[PDB]
């Protein structure tokens, strides 16, 4: 049927032309909980509402601070590559973190000491490129689609540094003198960037490996997140990757969260930094508690970006009949949360009861072990 | 008698209605030293000039960047609790540092790993809560009055995150699902925050201690400052607590300084960061030397906040007949100063004489040992 | 007696060393009204808490954004001159408005067309100097003390442009070529600025007037504020000067308000801009209403600066037994206010009743005429 | 002859009065490479275009963010001292790094623990003073001329903290009480700063050394850069000093680069931070590649400051017949670059060929060893 | 000969490699007047130090806030066109003012009511294009070279809105629907912008004029500056154009100043706004007096930009043997200045004497008429 912004005796039918589809995707916004209050920034933006850059070989679209101004420290690109297609050799000012949602791809990277790392990634794997280090992505036989996250909200991926672009804007005399070749020998350099371009499939990983007088990199730039043992609680699963296990990932900590229907990521906050979210699949609502009696609830589904400013209280509730699967990203060297449940369980029961005006029947259910995802009884 | 802004042949009597009381509290402002020069920001604000928030169980008032704009990195709350009264369980974005001026109180804190620390503090003790970590304060039988310092000037304590406020702005369905209880069971949750509230006195410390599967915290969140051996020089005493002795205090370094009458905190500066001051008792003047021939003198007494921007030269002189007692606060992992006296004592005497146009009779009195507080002969 | 921050069952006695004199000056800050709520910036500062610059012939002290950061658009100097003493010929980037509180002075100004205006100002008169136009102030037989207001909060009086300072930092060859004289004829130029200097009394005003070829200025730069007919209401008087009557005063609108014991400047706000206040004599309290359930009360007396950000609700109550006299200053081309009383009086009484849940007995007292100052019955 | 802004069919003769000398110093600006494109900030400023402060004993002139706004993190002073002349004892907020271009000088420094270090420096030596630590420079028998670099673009050296200035603006009573002497004994203190002043030559280094109860400094504050073994490639030499070899230099990394005629600093970028440059001798051009098809070429010669924002591609080409010698400065704890040549040499040749549309004849010349300076064949 | 930074006993010879040619251009910077003091921003930049954009038909180079950061409100382009060459139809956010230094050009503009103005401008004429109004410039038989000034310092000429660029980035279906034509009829549209392009000479002005239904523009967009009567004084001429005579020039006031050898633009300041300068021919020095004892002298010659922040004192002295010709530009609706001479001449002579410690022999030379340019006697 047709939803209306009505809650008990409050609200009214909509009398003007409206976007009923979007209203149906945002039931907790058209009709917020009575417990919402006050001004809170927007914490939700869909990749479907962004310009998609189409190239021969795939596409790329972004959610940055220009779409979602609350997220000043983190931005993201949803990138797709056809089989064999190459995201051109390049670098940026920002560090890059990635999750492989679909397919597989080969990455390259050269570090500051001239050492190369080349590796394949599959679904559920991560990669991380430190700031300034040059890299590439090439999709294998199935193609690839993945999420890139960059540690500056102002990022733009029409504005990174491309190999062929650099050369196209360096005097020919200089390129020739740099390499010890003639101007003639470099006459066929492309006159513009490629960005994404089609290419034949690469050979075996084993045959791409390049040996150097500087040795192997000390830590890999890929990580098999789904092959780790998750934190398992009743209604779901949590896989964490930060700089304590994925060693190179110094500026980005991540978690992949799965929430079964009827379950929720429990009430908690982060005492370290802001949370940036991407919703891979499913449907959720989350209330952000902003202090001083301020709270706003948001709805999310596949393709949405979410956000929770530093230290604000939140939960993520599955409100659909399918699994809810989302990433949590933090610009920091480690993941950390404080669980509301565990916090109160570790305090004297009389003290908690004095706060909450509730009795022993509440404090008895408190648990001193942390269960990030909990399921309704 | 009635003081006038007159110094030698300079200045004149006041001919308009005036605040004679305040003028008497500020003799070095109504009549600055001839050596003051140029524009310098205000470095002085009284808690008596702030709004006091009164609650059942005590009060709290603050000096922030909105009162004292030079102090952008540090703000402070003067908080008072009646016996048994509780400063409600809460958290903030800022780290918190505290000094117990009067009475005693019990604190609680839970860290990111779910480990609890509960302890009593008495006069002269400190506590420190890292950013984001939740905590509480409850005054014991004498009540309590203490100074809180927060590591962001923009702090406001009507704007921290309260337990009952968070719950009051979370949908009931969500609270019930989070804990595995019915909406009925949480029906009596307060509909608003408490902030400070009255409560019966707590039992023994020994009986409040809560055991956990995550073990004890690695370092205590309280510190007995007055039980340490002070640096002792002729006219006073200095007790320092930074992250090298009070291990958890990573973002705040402190010193409690006592200056006998006729004595002064010697000429020095800090090569690391800004100094924030609180005057516990007594009366002082301080000249801040701001470079480029700029200097301004300020007066201080009990209840005043003071400040010295990064690297500016200063001293703190007791100008009353009682002990002068004040705190120095630094947003850094350690205390450090450069003493003017010791600096010059460690340089060739001819070199110093060449600078100062003074002879061997001056350089002979220079001391290579540091005496933070010196007494007039 | 000794005031305590106690109101019924709220609050507690002060247990730490305190500023009792300042507490007596701020009773509505030590014990605010219970209707106060939430974070509001400081709206109060005393000239007695500022460094007084003393010179041969008088003094100058200032309240600027460095003292009162809410006041970004307006700054003030309290300046005193002994008989005959001269505030040196100078100019600034800011426009300058002034109120003569004590004595009398001669002012000079030259405009952009090379025309001069020279006039005497006594108690209750104003002057106004448009931005960048050069001027001077010289006290007459009685000396002078006055309040200067500048239309930028970042103002400093140590940093305006002084005549002798300009000449001291111009090459002697250039000064010589500028006036067609030799270097020797200007060798006695002061090597530095004077700022304020002693001098004999000037002669009669009529013998100082300088005629020239560009004619008289079109509008005077002085105004006799107390010689106008004030708005008189039950408990006081209001004298207004803005660009509509004091024609040159384009960037500053002003009002002098007198409030008898037991009276108040009524509840109102300004739809145009911020209010800057100076308290000439008497004792006051004001609550600033900041919207969204935020309000904060402040106390003021002789020598205090006050402030009310744009559109915020306020009243100014006399809480002493002597008349309360203050200036209201606005950076705009006219004075404007909305009176709470007059506003409701101009609406249908039943509409007002539906809002306030009061009856005809309330709406019957509302007045359609504006009475800016009302007296307690 | 007379150069014109003409390149092939583009540009035109200059028809207005012009600066032919400067045009001759900037041939790649009057006539940029065709490969330049788009808006790029200015990356070049000459010390010859700055105000020189002359004192008895030498001079000092600066290039700061007020001259070169792209350089917000780094500023520089070119300072000259006559034999025996002393740069007065002082300190700043910024850390200081220096290179001795001509002559020799003695430095002093006292650290936070009261330990002194006194040492001589000669041509090609460096010194580094951590922020806030007080120091001095005195030229020996040949005099001295050197480059100072400060780690804040906003630096000004008329605004650092001078010993005699501090004392000149401290009340005499306070100075006397600080040292335990009479006001009489300090009567001859200078009434103003000296900054740079003449003085007789110092005695032996051995006789200036001052012994302390706090021991020797753990790491020296001077460094003999030219006595280290340089990285040697075909057309030049690179000497690097960062915090890994010059231990105290925590915030500044440096390299001195020598480029023979016909040679160039190869194409590279820095993945860590911005580059600041000083051209000691010779003549160069450099193209800064700013991403998104933006590139601008600049010319440089002795006395010029240059700059390369974080991660932008660049090279430095000798375009004269003398050696090109320049400093590269980075605000970071280590030097790091990525060499374009080595980057591509460490990747599969087919992959590189696919990017560049070039064959095996290009990829064969790629070198896996880094040669910072390369010479034309 | 070889200039050295030596003035009497102050300064020393330059011991490091140096830019002797630039030093010869800046003698009052290598050896400033002793009356100079303190930190002042750079007020000088050369067009010769900027990247010259070369196109078929001419060139464009710019001085913006990225070159001269003190100039935040005004930027400039030196543009050259060959005979018949066209600066492509375009518009910008900034208003545009121009002075024709060489040759002649045809300009077009269309206003907000759809009315067109087309006119020819020769040497010494101005044009002005209000913000956002579309225009073009086309050189006549001689070619043209001119100075453009834009009322925002952040301007870039690579980033204005070009006709063909707009069409190139609009969907072909939309362009077709916009004009009621087919996609094929617009297939020959340029695929990119032209910016500057060659073209045959236009015909007579009379045959270019386009009549339309909205009528003639009310005020012309060109002005014959050199055909007005200048202010003539002893050593030169001043021609002023602002909104009072050149009616459309609402945001830019201008003056062309000619100063004979041995003459100077007298000591004055502007009470309204900043001054931006361009030096057309000749050689000058100017001291900018910045208040508080700060002043700095700069040298200028043909091709230089200069600046004087709001209200700062200045003069412009011809220091060569040829006439000195420069533009003064102000972002305001009128030109205004206060003359130091005229100012003092309009005050009582004894008041002036008391300030300057000079006698009647000085005040007797003061002139009540403004002479903007004075000649050395
Ligand atoms: Co990338
Ligand atoms: Co979270
Ligand atoms: Co707290
Ligand atoms: Co200190
Ligand atoms: Co004035
Ligand atoms: Co008002
Ligand atoms: Co230094
Ligand atoms: Co480099
Ligand atoms: Co244009
Ligand atoms: Co001028």
Swiss-Prot record, chains A, B, C, D, E:
Q: Which GO terms describe its cellular component?
A: cytoplasm
Q: Outcome of altering residue 265 to E? A: Leads to a 20-fold reduction of CO(2) production
Which cofactors are named for this entry? Mn(2+)
Binding locations of Mn(2+) 1: 90, 92, 96, 135
One GO term in the molecular function aspect is: metal ion binding
Q: How is activity modulated by pH?
A: Optimum pH is 5.0.
Using the UniProt annotation, give all residue ranges assigned to the region (Disordered). 19-42
Please give the SUPFAM superfamilies that the UniProt record associates with this protein. Answer: RmlC-like cupins (SSF51182)
Q: Which residues bind Mn(2+) 2?
A: 268, 270, 275, 314
Q: Can you tell me which residues form the catalytic site? A: 328 (proton donor)
Catalysed transformations (reactions): oxalate + H(+) = formate + CO2
Asked if Metal-binding is a keyword of the record, the answer is yes
- Name the CDD domains on file: cupin_OxDC_C, cupin_OxDC_N
Q: Which residues form the Cupin type-1 domain?
A: 45-187, 223-364
Q: What Enzyme Commission number does this protein have?
A: 4.1.1.2
Q: Which UniProt keywords apply?
A: Cytoplasm, Decarboxylase, Lyase, Manganese, Metal-binding
Provide the cofactor note recorded for this chain's UniProt entry: Binds 2 manganese ions per subunit.
GO biological process annotations for this chain's record?
A: oxalate metabolic process
Q: Where does the UniProt annotation locate this protein?
A: Cytoplasm
Pfam families for the chain: Cupin_1
Q: Which family does it belong to?
A: To B.subtilis OxdD.
What this chain does, per the entry, is described as:
Converts oxalate to formate and CO(2) in an O(2)-dependent reaction. Can also catalyze minor side reactions: oxalate oxidation to produce H(2)O(2), and oxalate-dependent, H(2)O(2)-independent dye oxidations.
- Quaternary structure and partners: Homohexamer.
Q: In its UniProt entry, what is this protein called?
A: Oxalate decarboxylase OxdC
State the organism of origin: Bacillus subtilis (strain 168)
Q: What gene name is listed for this protein?
A: oxdC
